[PDB]
Write a protein that binds this ligand. Structure first.
Ligand SMILES: [O-][O-]
Ligand SMILES: [Cu+2]
Ligand SMILES: [Cu+2]
Ligand SMILES: [Cu+2]
Ligand SMILES: [Cu+2]
Lengths: 533, 551
């Protein structure tokens, strides 16, 4: 310490290497030196001890729990949420992860590759960059978690044993410790959802009413995550379009937003410009991990279940976290490319531009001193010696955006992250009557879409709230069709981690129509008595 | 076998300090735990990690049942058919011996683990636990501690064990009951053991899976498709569709079937022991219930036509005769099938290969299982009479130690009685007769409906008007389904009319097979079954489905 974050060092045989789509990269590798390097290096990092600040646990620990120091910066986590430095704090955080993995790759080569092959393996390490998960791209008819994340094991090369491939536990599948995270040595223990009783990260694996020993490793219910990722209005199960892809398309193609509007859910005391990067990212966290531990009533089919990615304090432990944030960085770079003058340039985000991005250090070549990273340091992501295919070929970026992700009606949503004292919740919006026992997801009658509060005696910063936006065109057309042309009143339910409706929460929900005009104000829907909080 | 001599199956040898130890319910056994848990985990881990040339490896022991159809213990294989008996009256007795073999191998591995690992101070106490341990059973028909479930242990990827010589120290280790994993894809094992019979990509699996094989995912996902135990639980709790409507109480069909099986009097051995068919009231048999559980644990449909966000299909080893024995739950399932056989024997004491059909098979050699014949001084194969009394293999069940009819009702009959008592004193059953070879040996599922069938959704309890299923796990074959509650519901919606049973034969692609013959009928008696003259009241008919869903 300090650990200087630089990105992977420049090598002239490797001009601005790209971060590839992880599904494309996995298929290239198997259709495997880089795959071996990534698997082996990430395994080594996951097995480093807690007192090593470049262990996987400690790197994930920068984000949230267990809220310790990192790199000599005293330990809420370090992560930036609901502020305009969300994209840039995470830009540096993803680069730290990438850089540590690359360093571990070089160590792996020194340890395991014979002298005669070191140049070949080093070539591959120097070309590798952290792949991104394209959560909004149809997987090589539907959106999906990465192929590699759904694989318990992965086959790798053994250097010096040509045609000596071997199957190993996949470090992208889960992060597993040797004991329950609640029992780790001080001060690293993780001690709402029983994350203290988990040894491994899980997706939808934590459900009430099963033995607590099941929670030690609740499994990776990637089929369930995929279903959530493809959320869309209920009626489309009677032509569907996944809302996540439409939201991403709109984020990338809508012109005229300032940085403050694009960068964050933060609303400091319009609606057309409330589709923002952070809100989409919050929904993806919910969809990957699950946040509901139980459901009232009797149900044969159990669609709930909770996991690490839905929860701010522990989401960073799931290896997909980094791949998600890699794409969030990619989306930022794309938006920057097509909105090149909009950088901390509005009267709301300007104040935050010079925030130190603690705990991340760099060397100042002007002061000749170690300082914290600041947003302007990473405005050009290529300064960190990586790029994306889509931003290298800028000339045709609009066409590529259309090929990947392509009156109007929109829903606006304004809410307090601390409406429940800081606990997470999901805002579900419906057109028409709400089923008092089924108000949760796309299988719930009349469901149109959700907004997840990715948060987790406590109140928000004075004057600050949070915003999101949902597409509503197709769902309003269906509703009119079934309802004699009535413009629907949006109905909402605020759902907590017990699958109950929090009657006392008020959210501002409105429907707007195209220049957008407000055409209906939303109202809370009642649910059954056994389903009320 | 090992050494180059036959492997003699004895069951765990008798020790006078250990009189007829019981096979416990695996959830109860787990919940009270922890030396026996440690011994079972460490021994089974060693057995699973044994090399393919070792005939007491997990792979080769599973290999006896089906694929890859090799020899075992000097007995030629390559019959493709395995050594297992299916659709014949020796089904319960062949499996009785098979389960005992597994149990004996585990016990012997426990003794070796103690010899290599346990300090002098603890050896006699660990030896005493090995001698008291017997293979637990999975009670698939008992409510878990409102619903049927896979065992707790089967759903845990890791398990904490003791470390001998390190007091109070425990280590979390991969749970050998969660899955069986090899070091490579089973399709590329060293000859002759490759798994390569079947249409699902089992050749592309390195590990066993529950509901994890689906079309349209990268083939490397199939190497280990995972354990979707929540989905398997859902399947295990199959019941008529109408019971998920508000204002109606549900009963798990599996529990109703098992209570019927155990309580119905007057079956001969041939009716009880097998699906084999060469009065429909007597067609509820052990093998048919076992077949449905195989399906519900593993999943058999790889695909479904059309577009579906919620994907309720998926295939896994337990549904597939050639590879089912590789899933560790297989043995726990078959341990309960042995227990159900012992219960039924206890309450049907004269009914042992007692009919003209089964008498023919009573003397069949149960290959490949050897034992030493003390009266002729020869190593011979097991025969059914050798295992008529399961206690001769030095194990027992708590339920067979005495009161049995009351235990059967307490365990399997309370929910059925509670809901049936709400309706009139009548019973309805469905009879189902099919040919196991109707699809060339390919497996298939027979779903029955009362009322109109949704031509895009004819699959499971979520399918409109679904009544129940019969699974062809694989002379004719028969099964029976409870129908009393579904008939009541249909009558209330149809001004008293008796429903025509409608059936669909579904293949592994989720498509309807139109040339698979199934004989379905609905039968009625006055009086409730648990308190006898059944008459046919309706003939079945094949349901049509949407054109895109037709095979
Ligand atoms: O019968 O497996
Ligand atoms: Cu975060
Ligand atoms: Cu995040
Ligand atoms: Cu079998
Ligand atoms: Cu079986």
């Amino acid at each position: 310490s300090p650990y200087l974050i630089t990105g992977i060092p420049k090598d002239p045989k490797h001009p601005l290497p790209i971060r590839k789509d992880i599904d494309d990269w996995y298929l290239e590798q198997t259709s495997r030196i880089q795959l071996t390097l990534f698997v082996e290096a990430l395994t080594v990092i996951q097995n480093r001890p807690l007192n090593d600040q470049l262990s996987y646990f400690r790197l994930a620990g920068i984000h949230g729990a267990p809220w310790t120091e990192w790199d000599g910066v005293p330990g809420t986590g370090f992560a930036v949420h609901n502020n305009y430095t969300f994209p840039t704090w995470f830009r540096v955080y993803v680069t730290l992860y990438e850089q540590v993995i690359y360093e571990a790759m070089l160590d792996f080569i020194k340890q395991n590759v014979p002298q005669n092959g070191k140049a070949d393996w080093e070539n591959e390490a120097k070309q590798w960059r952290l792949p991104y998960w394209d959560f909004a791209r149809f997987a090589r008819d539907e959106l999906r978690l990465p192929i590699l994340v759904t694989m318990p094991m992965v086959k790798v090369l053994v250097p010096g044993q040509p045609g000596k491939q071997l199957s190993k536990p996949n470090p992208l599948y889960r992060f597993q410790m040797q004991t329950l995270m609640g029992t780790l040595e001080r001060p690293y223990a993780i001690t709402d959802l029983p994350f203290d009783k988990c040894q491994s990260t899980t997706k939808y694996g934590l459900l009430e009413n099963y033995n607590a020993d099941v929670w030690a490793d609740g499994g990776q219910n990637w089929l369930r995550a995929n279903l959530a990722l493809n959320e869309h209005p209920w009626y489309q199960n009677l032509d569907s379009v996944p809302t996540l892809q439409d939201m991403t398309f709109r984020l990338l193609t809508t012109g005229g937003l300032n940085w403050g509007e694009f960068s964050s859910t933060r609303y400091d005391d319009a609606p057309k410009n409330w589709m923002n990067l952070e809100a989409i990212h919050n929904n993806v966290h919910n969809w990957v991990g699950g946040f509901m531990f139980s459901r009232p009533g009797r149900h044969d089919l159990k669609l709930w279940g909770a996991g690490h990615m839905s929860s701010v304090p522990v989401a960073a432990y799931d290896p997909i976290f980094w791949l998600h944030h890699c794409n969030i960085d990619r989306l930022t770079a794309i938006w920057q490319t097509v909105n090149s003058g909009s950088w901390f340039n509005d009267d709301k985000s300007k104040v935050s531009k010079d925030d130190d991005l603690r705990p991340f250090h760099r060397f100042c070549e002007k002061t000749r001193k170690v300082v914290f990273f600041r947003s302007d340091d990473v405005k050009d992501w290529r300064s960190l010696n990586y790029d994306y295919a889509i931003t290298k070929d800028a000339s045709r970026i609009r066409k590529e955006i259309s090929d990947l992700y392509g009156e109007d009606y929109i829903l606006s949503i304004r809410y307090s992250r601390y409406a429940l004292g800081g606990k997470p919740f999901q805002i579900n919006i419906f057109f028409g009557d709400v089923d008092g026992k089924d108000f949760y997801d796309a299988r719930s009658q009349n469901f149109v879409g959700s907004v997840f509060n990715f948060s987790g005696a406590q109140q928000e910063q004075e004057g600050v709230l949070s915003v999101s936006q949902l597409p509503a065109r197709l769902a309003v057309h269906y509703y009119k069709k079934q309802n004699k042309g009535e413009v629907p009143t949006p109905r909402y339910v605020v759902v907590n981690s017990q699958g109950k409706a929090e009657a006392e929460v008020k959210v501002e929900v409105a429907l707007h129509k195209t220049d957008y005009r407000r055409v209906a104000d939303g109202k809370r829907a009642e649910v059954d008595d056994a389903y009320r909080a």
